[PDB]
């Protein structure tokens, strides 16, 4: 049960520091050196720093001055501190543990970071349903399109849960500081429109939770 | 020490052998290969070159010495289409930009589905008509749009889904972002999905209302 969980990925704007909490369970810790990996949206991995099991920092010259590698061995906790952000430091922050010579055999799922001068702004709902009497054949498909939102990401579902097959959630793409994000399913033309299908759909930031049933023609 | 991936994505049915292969910028006494799937952390897979970390199948090798090294399923499965990184901490640490393994499935041709906004959208007073082109293969594919027949490329957000765990198909959605004042200057709104699959493409639209 060697578990590690990471803590803290927010936004705050270019220039602002912000603190990594990643806790460790299910090995002794203080035997281990830990390390932070960093994984770009484009999914470049990029050594960030490694700290011994005897408190000796490791840095790249990049990283070096503006990140402070760090543990407690009795709470068993790893901290970043990161200062002063670009939109480069803008990723996924993995904590993994390697012994020795050895290469890191363990990786926690990481806390994400985004680093902008965009606003939380909520997300708005429509769903997109095109039949009013034609293509009422073998099967139809049914949406729910989900425009202009910040910070990502945002989490859905069909019917809290029910439809797997089928489905398609498609990842947000940036207009300019508005995050839009599509999503579709399929279903038997014996099953719609008879069963009503509702996307419930959470952003993080702003906490707003509207549902939506896919209306009618 | 760069470390160097090419392909950085590429293809194979399973029961075909696949090659992955490393090389490093200078000279390193060991290479060490994570796993990483959507939505997950890297695993680590091949270590010390050649030791396979515990879980992984025997189709899984890793060989290689100094400056070149790869990576070699025997036996290809559907289980195996993941991002396969190579690493090094000889120096200080560093990663290949991964090669990409997708599943090559026979052709598909996509299930296009065009939908006009919805009565809250109109409202808001900004037209995104959507496109779902879902279901086909190759992932390679251009959609081109006609505002009243005139070939109209501007206000579209196209986004992809990573490869099908079930069909091992990839899918598609279109947005053409206009405004109402633009949504009510215009009649025909068509939907050109075209694919190696035909020479004749697989349109659907509509005539605004009715
Ligand atoms: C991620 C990882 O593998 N991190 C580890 C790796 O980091 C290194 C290795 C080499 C150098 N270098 O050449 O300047 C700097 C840091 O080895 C260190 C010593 O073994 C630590 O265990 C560290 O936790």
């Known amino acids: 049960e060697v578990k590690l969980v990471e803590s803290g990925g927010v936004l705050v704007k270019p220039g602002g520091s912000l603190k990594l909490s990643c806790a460790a369970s299910g090995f002794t810790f203080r035997n281990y050196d830990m390390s932070w990996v960093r994984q770009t949206p484009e999914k470049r991995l990029e050594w960030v720093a490694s700290?011994?099991?005897?408190?000796?920092?490791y840095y790249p010259d990049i990283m070096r001055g503006r990140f402070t590698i760090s543990r407690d061995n009795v709470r068993n906790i790893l901290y970043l501190e990161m200062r002063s952000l670009r939109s480069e430091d803008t990723a996924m922050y993995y904590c993994?543990?390697?012994?020795?010579?050895?290469?890191?055999?363990?990786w926690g799922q990481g806390t994400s970071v985004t680093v902008s001068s965009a606003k939380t702004t909520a997300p708005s709902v429509y769903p997109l349903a095109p039949v009013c009497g034609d293509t009422t054949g073998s099967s139809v498909t049914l949406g729910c399109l989900v425009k202009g939102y910040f910070p990502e990401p945002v989490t859905l579902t069909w019917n809290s849960g029910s439809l797997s097959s089928g489905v398609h959630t498609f990842p947000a793409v940036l207009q300019s500081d508005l995050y839009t994000l599509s999503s579709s399913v399929t279903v038997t033309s014996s099953t719609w429109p008879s069963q009503s299908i509702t996307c419930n759909v959470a952003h993080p930031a702003s906490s707003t939770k509207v549902d939506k049933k896919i209306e009618p023609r | 020490i760069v470390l160097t991936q090419s392909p950085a994505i590429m293809s194979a049915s399973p029961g075909e052998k696949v090659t992955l292969t490393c090389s490093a910028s200078?000279?390193?006494?060991?290479i060490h290969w994570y796993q990483q799937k959507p939505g997950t952390s890297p695993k680590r897979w091949i270590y010390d070159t050649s030791i396979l970390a515990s879980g992984v199948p025997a189709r899984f090798s890793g060989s290689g010495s100094e400056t070149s090294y790869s990576l070699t399923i025997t036996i290809m499965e559907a289980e195996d289409a993941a991002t396969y990184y190579c690493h090094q901490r000889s120096s200080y640490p560093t990663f290949g930009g991964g090669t990409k393994l997708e599943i090559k499935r026979a052709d598909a041709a996509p299930t296009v589905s065009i939908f006009p906004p919805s009565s809250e959208q109109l409202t808001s007073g900004g037209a995104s008509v959507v496109c779902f082109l879902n279901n086909f293969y190759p992932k390679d594919i251009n959609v081109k749009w006609k505002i009243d027949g005139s070939e109209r490329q501007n206000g579209v957000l196209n986004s992809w889904t990573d490869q099908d765990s079930k069909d091992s198909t990839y899918s598609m959605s279109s947005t053409l972002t206009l405004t109402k004042d633009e949504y009510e200057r215009h009649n025909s709104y068509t939907c050109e999905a075209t694919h190696k699959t035909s020479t004749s493409p697989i349109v659907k639209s509509f005539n605004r209302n009715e």
């Open positions: 200078s000279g390193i006494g060991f």
């Open positions: 993994a543990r390697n012994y020795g010579h050895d290469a890191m055999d363990y």
């Open positions: 700290i011994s099991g005897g408190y000796t920092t």
